[PDB]
Ligand binder design. Structure first.
Ligand code: CDL
Ligand code: BCL
Ligand code: BCL
Ligand code: BCL
Ligand code: BPH
Ligand code: BPH
Ligand code: U10
Ligand code: SPO
Ligand code: UQ2
Ligand code: LDA
Ligand code: LDA
Ligand code: LDA
Ligand code: LDA
Ligand code: LDA
Ligand code: FE
Lengths: 240, 281, 302
């Protein structure tokens, strides 16, 4: 019976497809580790796939995966229990240390680049001739944190050139320096920009960028991780 | 037991109930209060199904079937062996699903991410509830709900549909179907596009998201963009289910005749109802 | 309440984006269409440019011909009366030749020949469109995943209108061009083969259709949830894993005990979707050629 054959064949094909898909999905984060960083004894029934290499544009190199994995940064956490499977308490200030929901990854300390090799993200002032085309222009608005205090004022928007979208608000603080706030973490209102994630005293602690007209993948990770971390860690000073 | 990058995220906090009491993992799985609730609901539910299987006198997975009360019980209880198990298993199911969603919320909070996922999942739960709860209640009996069995739930779909003629003519069903098909279309295209950029022709560099926009503009004159496509996939698949639930909650309540006759309202409009020729004159 | 990233709060625009050049013949690209503020609340504001070219023109002209062939036939059925046209729009139907003509091209225009002409134009419209999905990827130096995916949709289409009719020995088996009639054809197809619920390939096609919505709801929600870390910039997260891709993987590892990667989710995506119409086309192709009655087959598995 041909249909019997087809269905039986299909299920064999699907077992193979799922094996292929699961192993493809092990190109990052494996081998599994124990809480102390060493290889775990049980790696499960799926073995790592043969590595593959991505050629990165603009002379940025290649990436081969799976490859040796490491955090490449210190992790200020310690065990809270004598056996596996419990949480790890922050050893200092988890926002400053960048752990928990405040975590960042040691991504490349270069800016993401567009298909022409230009910086993907720029302050709008340096982006010819990008402008607000719809919605409330946030530039000039006071910025308020979850303590309902004013933290600073919006002085620009950083935009993704190739995708024509707003990515960050640049916010000037009381001392005259600025910080980037992710577009996804602000509520633009008629008279203010509101930030639920941070109280006003946490703005100064937002990670700074090194060059005032670009931002690197590493810097984006620190800023975003830090702002998101405020949901958990600023919660004492909020208040709605 | 941990992904190479995982430990920095396994901090305390984010739980909704119980403070630190259940704030831990078992292998990969987070627990939480709702992990315990899920296990309790699911376990009780699975035990009751096995008991239903005994009373039915079968262990075959293709035969086991747990039926809701016969229509005569209305919206009241039924002896265990005659609809009561169904009723308890349904409460367990519901408990399990809502517990799963709420565990997902605890996970979001620990990870500092948005709640989109448990929100999306709550659409699926709402659909299940439409069929086993909202619709049977509005119609006046549990027996209108589908039974829990692999082939018997399909008998229920077929029987329920053919109660109203060809169920294709349910207009809410037509919209739902359109969202399902379009969703699979968008899914294929999204998967294909990302992969085609990441895995370009032999020896070439990875394409960029600018190439992704370009390919789609070249192809059809438009590209929704990388944020937009993920907005879209979510909208399409939740819309599909919103309309699935709609299409059933209106069926047997506000509309209970043959769905194909619903369309007569349009043909019978005064200004053309009587002009001869075409199909309906 | 927190912002949810369903609709943008602020749109920005700059110079029309004319896209990447690579090996694309630029003479065949239009200029930019208008900018839709409406669209830009959800996705991109920009329309165009589009790529024209020879295959493009062929495909569009052919597709219009298919469309105009059916619509001409509909006007005829309407007796050329605009009010009857609109009244009866979903009832009209361009139907294939009767069984007696088998696979011949000998049927009269009004009784099947016109169905064949519309079908012919559809065939060249789709295939030349398929060719377009290959060629636009090629010109840009991209992989061929789009055209490989599209081919799975083509497969169910070809099975329905072309391959299954040929194997069954008549065009009468094919699908009619009409809103209501294509639905009646579908109900009928199932009734006449003993209920498609018993066709294991139909049931797989369902698992995959529902799986697509499950999966796109999962993935779309996951990306939006980590968009506050740039999660939707998926190609760069592939190249250089960020906290977005990690928080996303761990949401799922912690929920259900396994997870994907930034690249690999897109492979789960493409296969979950293409497997709908594959499985599907197989289940239909086997219907009537090898299996007359799925319920019966299911009683034997044979
Ligand atoms: C009858 C059915 C009719 C079928 C109709 C239509 C089918 C359409 C298929 C749609 C394909 C979409 C998938 C996309 C994809 O990943 O492939 C890209 C890839 C093309 O890459 P590209 O985009 O050009 O460039 C990017 C990179 O260079 C390379 O790109 P990449 O690395 O991203 O992709 C590499 C990819 C390329 O893989 C393929 O070529 C496709 C493959 C699969 C094969 C078998 C199909 C079976 C169909 C179901 C059978 C049901 C039975 C009934 O590798 C795989 O994904 C692998 C395979 C997994 C299947 C393993 C399975 C099961 C066997 C099991 C036994 C095990 C255990 C038993 C217990 O596909 C091909 O190479 C196909 C070439 C076809 C040439 C035609 C000449 C034939 C004569
Ligand atoms: C002969 C049968 C009739 C018919 C009768 C009906 C009937 C009756 C119904 C549909 C419904 C559906 N039909 Mg119909 N319909 C037919 C023809 C079709 C055709 C077609 C191509 O011909 C199509 C595409 C569809 C498509 C549609 C969908 C819009 C809809 C089903 C999806 C859904 O409800 O999801 C919603 C998703 C869920 C309900 C699942 C939720 C589950 C979640 C909460 C959890 C499960 C977890 C757990 C148990 C998993 C185990 C854990 C393990 C570890 C994995 N029908 C024919 C004409 N159709 C149904 C509908 O809209 O229902 C609302 C419906 O009731
Ligand atoms: C949605 C609208 C209709 C419906 C109409 C259809 C039709 C029509 C078909 C199915 C089919 C399926 N349906 Mg149904 N079915 C509905 C209600 C559901 C519900 C529920 C609401 O709780 C569940 C769990 C199922 C589950 C099932 C699977 C057995 C099968 C493949 C589904 C799938 O891949 O989904 C997509 C999701 C995934 C890919 C995730 C994987 C999860 C699946 C595999 C979970 C299976 C759980 C099952 C064995 C329950 C065991 C419970 C245990 C005690 C825990 N249906 C309602 C009543 N269903 C197909 C079949 O072949 O049936 C025989 C089929 O043709
Ligand atoms: C009474 C109805 C019967 C039944 C009869 C059928 C029949 C007949 C078929 C299906 C098929 C399917 N059924 Mg069923 N269906 C049943 C009940 C169900 C139920 C349910 C009860 O809940 C569900 C969910 C489904 C679900 C499904 C899908 C899984 C599947 C089609 C997938 C697809 O994406 O095709 C949609 C995608 C396509 C058609 C491919 C499109 C191809 C490309 C080339 C399009 C080109 C168009 C272009 C030219 C148009 C131009 C316009 C542009 C905008 C320019 N069926 C009942 C039992 N079902 C199909 C299948 O594969 O079955 C095995 C099928 O043939
Ligand atoms: C809303 C859009 C689509 C969608 C989205 C969606 N589903 C979701 C979620 C999302 C976003 C996830 O967060 C969640 C998930 O964790 O996925 C991996 C999930 C999920 N969707 C799932 C299944 C599923 N989703 C489905 C559909 C859909 N889900 C929609 C199409 C279907 C269909 C189409 O039939 C199924 C079968 C699970 C994989 C998962 C939720 C798992 C869960 O709740 O686990 C807790 C409960 C148990 C471990 C089992 C409980 C056992 C019961 C108490 C007894 C069984 C009773 C049951 C009623 C009997 C059914 C018998 C059948 C033969 C009918
Ligand atoms: C894998 C399974 C899913 C799938 C996959 C899929 N479909 C796809 C793709 C893939 C990956 C292709 O890349 C291809 C595509 O280009 O998508 C954008 C396609 C496609 N699937 C399409 C539709 C479609 N897919 C189907 C669904 C599915 N597709 C499955 C669910 C269905 C259903 C569910 O019935 C539909 C109807 C098209 C959008 C596209 C194929 C386009 C095509 O073949 O064109 C041929 C004909 C024309 C070019 C013109 C036709 C005539 C029009 C009626 C005229 C009106 C508009 C006209 C363009 C105006 C121009 C006027 C000018 C003169 C000014
Ligand atoms: C970009 O990002 C993304 C990722 O990451 C980078 C991802 O990972 C994912 C996730 C997606 C995948 C891994 C792709 C494959 C997934 C599917 C096709 C979805 C369907 C899923 C299944 C078929 C399996 C579902 C299995 C479940 C739900 C596990 C059942 C668990 C139990 C044993 C239940 C009992 C209760 C528990 C575990 C609570 C704990 C309690 C105790 C044990 C006590 C997405 C979407 C994503 O977009
Ligand atoms: C207002 O008036 C205007 C001018 C605007 C005209 C209006 C147009 C209208 C109202 C037309 C509407 C068209 C409709 C309703 C189309 C609907 C079609 C549907 C629902 C299609 C559904 C299924 C179609 C399938 C499965 C078709 C399969 C086709 C093939 C696989 C092609 C097979 C080719 C054949 C048989 C020819 C083979 C020839 C060779 C070369 C050997
Ligand atoms: C590969 O990802 C995808 C995009 O590519 C970047 C798209 O753009 C679209 C097209 C979506 C829409 C809203 C078309 C209708 C809008 C107009 C022009 C009126 C789909 C489906 C898609 O899957
Ligand atoms: C079609 C759905 C199938 C999904 C289940 C297959 C994957 C199971 C879990 C993979 C193992 C995770 N692990 C051990 C490698 O970490
Ligand atoms: C499926 C999406 C369909 C998109 C519609 C096509 C819009 C592109 C039109 C571009 C024409 C540019 N123009 C008018 C200046 O020549
Ligand atoms: C295919 C996408 C179509 C997009 C249409 C949706 C428009 C909704 C706009 C809502 C914006 C609300 N507002 C004023 C706060 O920006
Ligand atoms: C991308 C792979 C995901 C695989 C999902 C598999 C779902 C299994 C559903 C069983 C279908 C039953 N049957 C008899 C119709 O074949
Ligand atoms: C269809 C149900 C299958 C569920 C697939 C999920 C399996 C995850 C199991 C996690 C165990 C990992 N391990 C082996 C390292 O302990
Ligand atoms: Fe994606």
């Amino acid at each position: 019976d041909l249909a019997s054959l087809a269905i039986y064949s299909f299920w064999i094909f699907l077992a193979g497809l799922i094996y292929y898909l699961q192993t493809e999905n092990m190109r990052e984060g494996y081998p599994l580790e124990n809480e102390d960083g060493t290889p775990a004894a049980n790696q499960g029934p799926f073995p790592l796939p043969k590595p593959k290499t991505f050629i990165l544009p603009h002379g940025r190199g290649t990436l081969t995966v799976p490859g040796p994995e490491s955090e490449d940064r210190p992790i200020a956490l310690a065990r809270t229990a004598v056996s596996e499977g419990f949480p790890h308490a922050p050893t200092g200030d988890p926002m400053k240390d960048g752990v928990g929901p405040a975590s960042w990854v040691a991504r490349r300390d270069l800016p993401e680049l567009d298909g022409h090799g230009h910086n993907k993200i720029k302050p709008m002032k340096a982006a010819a001739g990008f402008h607000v085309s719809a919605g409330k222009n946030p530039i000039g608005l006071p910025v308020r944190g979850c303590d309902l205090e004013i933290a600073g004022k919006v002085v620009d928007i950083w935009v993704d050139i190739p995708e024509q979208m707003a990515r960050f608000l640049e916010v000037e603080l009381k001392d005259g320096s600025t910080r980037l706030l992710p577009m996804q973490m602000v509520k633009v209102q008629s008279n203010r920009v509101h930030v639920n994630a941070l109280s006003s005293d946490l703005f100064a602690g937002i990670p700074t960028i090194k060059s005032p007209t670009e931002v690197t993948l590493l810097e984006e990770d620190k800023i975003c991780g830090y702002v998101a971390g405020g949901l958990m860690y600023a919660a004492p000073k909020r208040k709605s | 037991a941990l992904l190479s990058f995982e430990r920095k995220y396994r901090v305390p906090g984010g739980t909704l109930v119980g403070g630190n009491l259940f704030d831990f993992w078992v292998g990969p799985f987070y627990v939480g209060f709702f992990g315990v609730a899920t296990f309790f609901f699911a376990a009780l539910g699975i035990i009751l199904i096995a008991w239903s299987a005994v009373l039915q006198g079968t262990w075959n997975p293709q035969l086991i079937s747990v039926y809701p009360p016969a229509l005569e019980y209305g919206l009241g209880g039924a002896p265990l062996a005659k609809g009561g198990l169904w009723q308890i298993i349904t409460i367990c199911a519901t408990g399990a699903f809502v517990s799963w969603a709420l565990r997902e919320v605890e996970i979001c909070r620990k990870l500092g991410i948005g709640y989109h996922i448990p929100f999306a999942f709550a659409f699926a739960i709402l659909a299940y509830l439409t069929l086993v709860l909202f619709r049977p209640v509005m119609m006046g009996a549990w027996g209108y709900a589908f039974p829990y069995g692999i082939w018997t739930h399909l008998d229920w779909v077929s029987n329920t549909g053919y109660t109203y003629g060809n169920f294709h003519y349910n207009p809410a069903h037509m919209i739902a179907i359109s969202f399902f098909f379009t969703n699979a279309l968008a899914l294929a295209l999204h998967g294909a596009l990302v992969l085609s950029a990441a895995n370009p022709e032999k020896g070439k560099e990875m394409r960029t998201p600018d190439h992704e926009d370009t390919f789609f503009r070249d192809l059809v004159g438009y590209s929704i963009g990388t944020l937009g496509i993920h907005r879209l996939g979510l909208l399409l698949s939740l819309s599909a289910v919103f309309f699935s639930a709609l299409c059933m909650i209106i069926t047997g309540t506000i509309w209970f005749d043959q769905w194909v006759d619903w369309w007569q309202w349009w043909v019978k409009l005064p200004w053309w109802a009587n002009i001869p020729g075409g199909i309906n004159g | 309440a927190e912002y949810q990233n369903i609709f943008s709060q602020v749109q920005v625009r700059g110079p029309a984006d004319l896209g990447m050049t690579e090996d694309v013949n630029l003479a065949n690209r239009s200029g930019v269409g208008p900018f839709s503020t409406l669209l830009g609340w959800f996705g991109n504001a920009q329309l165009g440019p589009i790529y024209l070219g020879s295959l493009g023109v062929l495909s569009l002209f052919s597709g219009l011909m298919w469309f105009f062939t059916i619509g001409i036939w509909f006007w005829y059925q309407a007796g050329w009366n605009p009010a009857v046209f609109l009244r009866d729009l979903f009832f009209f139907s361009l139907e294939p030749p009767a069984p007696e003509y088998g696979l011949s091209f000998a049927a009269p225009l009004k009784e099947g020949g016109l169905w064949l002409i519309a079908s012919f134009f559809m065939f060249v419209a789709v295939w030349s469109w398929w060719g377009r999905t290959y060629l636009r990827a090629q010109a840009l130096g991209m992989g061929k995943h789009t055209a490989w995916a599209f081919l799975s949709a083509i497969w169910l289409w070809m099975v329905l209108g072309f391959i299954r009719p040929i194997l069954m020995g008549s065009w009468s088996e094919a699908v009619p061009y009409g809103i209501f009639s294509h639905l009646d054809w579908t109900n009928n197809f199932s009734l006449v083969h003993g209920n498609l619920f018993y066709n294991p390939f139909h049931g797989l096609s369902i698992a995959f259709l529902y799986g697509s919505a499950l999966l796109f709801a999962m993935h779309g929600a996951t990306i939006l949830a980590v968009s506050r870390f740039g999660g939707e910039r998926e190609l760069e997260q592939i190249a250089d894993r960020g906290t977005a891709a990690e928080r996303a993987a761990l949401f799922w590892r912690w929920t259900m005990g396994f997870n994907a990667t930034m690249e690999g989710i897109h492979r789960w995506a493409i296969w979950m979707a293409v497997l709908v119409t594959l499985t599907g086309g197989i289940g239909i192709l086997l219907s009537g050629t090898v299996v007359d009655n799925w319920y019966v087959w299911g009683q034997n598995h044979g």
